């Protein structure tokens, strides 16, 4: 039919992103990744919403 090409992507309510703070990159990101997973402890996943 080809009359519905781009149907759901056009019907989705356009919601833009949010002005969020920057993120550490390189060694600083690994540092945050380390002390959060190994140092700061005390099972759920890193993104577990339950």
């Amino acid at each position: 039919s080809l009359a519905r090409a781009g149907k759901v992507r056009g019907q989705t309510p356009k919601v833009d992103k949010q002005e969020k703070k920057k993120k550490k990159t390189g060694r600083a990101k690994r540092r945050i990744q380390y002390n959060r997973r190994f140092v700061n402890v005390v099972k759920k996943g890193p993104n577990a919403n339950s």
């Binding site: 390189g26 690994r30 540092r31 990744q33 380390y34 997973r37 190994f38």
Partner: protein, 180 residues
């Protein structure tokens, strides 16, 4: 025809399992403990150990009193004791197969300047090396991966131009002094 050499070799190797959980934990543990930037520096020091172990493993195949084993074996042993990764008490070809990746990570420049009390933390150690603060025997080094040998162990100190040692203040020290 040009006067170039075109020789270049890689220093690391990617693991076979891309998302092995048991591997990601021990590699991330090495990064935070020694203050590394990425996993490439972990795979690099593992590849460095693999070259030394493979070189020693070839010598263990050769029988004793061999002119090639005695020469290359003693050269490799004295080279490891030179950088400090191998002790002088037991320098044999079979103890090279008992070396860990942590032994090489302790001879880096960022970890030595941290153990010498010149830096607060291991991350503070890497940031001042890249800022031309510390030297080794009157030689300013800007690289954190400088493999310090035992002959240059007691010569790591701040440069003669850095404000941490004896020198002129930084750009932001006098800037705040001029405004007030």
């Amino acid at each position: 025809p040009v006067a170039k050499t075109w020789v270049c070799s890689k220093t690391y190797v990617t693991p076979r399992r891309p998302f092995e959980k048991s591997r990601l934990d021990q590699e991330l543990r090495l990064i935070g403990e020694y203050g590394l930037r990425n996993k490439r520096e972990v795979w690099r020091v593992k590849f460095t150990l693999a070259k030394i172990r493979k070189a020693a493993r070839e010598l263990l195949t050769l029988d004793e009193k061999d002119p090639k084993r005695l020469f290359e074996g003693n050269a490799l042993l004295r080279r490891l004791v030179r950088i400090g990764v191998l002790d002088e008490g037991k320098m044999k070809l079979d103890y090279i197969l008992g070396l860990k990746v942590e032994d090489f990570l302790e001879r880096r420049l960022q970890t030595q300047v941290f153990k010498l009390g010149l830096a607060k933390s291991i991350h503070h150690a890497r940031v001042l090396i890249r800022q031309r603060h510390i030297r080794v025997r009157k030689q300013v080094v800007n690289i954190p991966s400088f493999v310090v040998r035992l002959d240059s162990q007691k010569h790591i100190d701040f440069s003669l131009r850095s404000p941490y040692g004896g020198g002129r203040p930084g750009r932001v020290k006098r800037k705040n002094a001029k405004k007030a």
